[PDB]
């Protein structure tokens, strides 16, 4: 598998990542962690 | 030295 990433606006990416972290902070549901660990 | 820097250094000291 290859994981090339296109050119991205790096400052905007940082802002969008933080906003996504904020959606995570405001979400009590952490079950994705357990789903990821149990995946085949 | 700084107690915080020292505590962190001591915390990470590999023994």
């Amino acid at each position: 598998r290859s994981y090339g990433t296109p050119e991205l606006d790096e400052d905007d990416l940082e802002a969008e990542l933080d906003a996504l972290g904020d959606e995570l902070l405001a979400d009590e549901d952490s079950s994705y962690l357990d789903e990821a660990a149990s995946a085949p | 030295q700084d107690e915080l820097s020292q505590r962190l250094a001591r915390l990470r000291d590999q023994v």
């Binding site: 969008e16 990542l17 972290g21 902070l25 995946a39 | -």
Partner: protein
């Protein structure tokens, strides 16, 4: 663990890694410890002098010491080389879960969060030293996919 003071504005860049620590306080205390260690080391480099910042770091240090005491007989805590290995395998597992969902065309919050948190865990791994080649690539890719897929969903685009 004694709660931390309000996060100083200076430390915005460790906010999310501290949430990853809390997410793991029961699930994986080794991960929780190292997320806090990354946050502490990073914060000390940012600002260890402004009173609000120093207060915050002092309390984070208290949490680290309490955790290290609680988990003292754990090889992943007494040897950072072993802790790094634990974080590496754990983060990879999470990354590959998200990757596999993406490549199956299954787009949802759980896989977005998995890409996002995998990237945060790779940030945390920098506390141990230079990232591996795969870590550099996977982190770049996870940051891209977390945001790209989130954006596609909210705006009706097909990834």
């Amino acid at each position: 663990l004694a709660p931390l003071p309000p996060l100083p504005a200076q430390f915005k860049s460790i906010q999310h890694h501290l949430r990853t620590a809390q997410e793991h306080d029961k699930r994986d205390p080794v991960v929780a410890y190292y997320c806090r260690l990354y946050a502490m080391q990073t914060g000390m480099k940012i600002d260890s002098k402004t009173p609000e910042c120093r207060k915050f770091l002092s309390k984070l240090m208290d949490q680290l010491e309490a955790l290290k005491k609680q988990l003292g007989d754990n090889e992943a805590i007494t040897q950072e080389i072993v802790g790094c290995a634990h974080l590496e395998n754990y983060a990879l597992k999470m990354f590959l879960y998200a990757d596999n969902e993406d490549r199956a065309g299954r787009f949802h919050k759980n896989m977005i969060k998995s890409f996002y948190t995998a990237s945060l865990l790779i940030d945390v791994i920098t506390v141990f030293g230079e990232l591996t080649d795969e870590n550099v690539k996977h982190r770049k890719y996870a940051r891209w996919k977390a945001t790209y897929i989130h954006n596609c969903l909210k705006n009706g685009e097909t990834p």
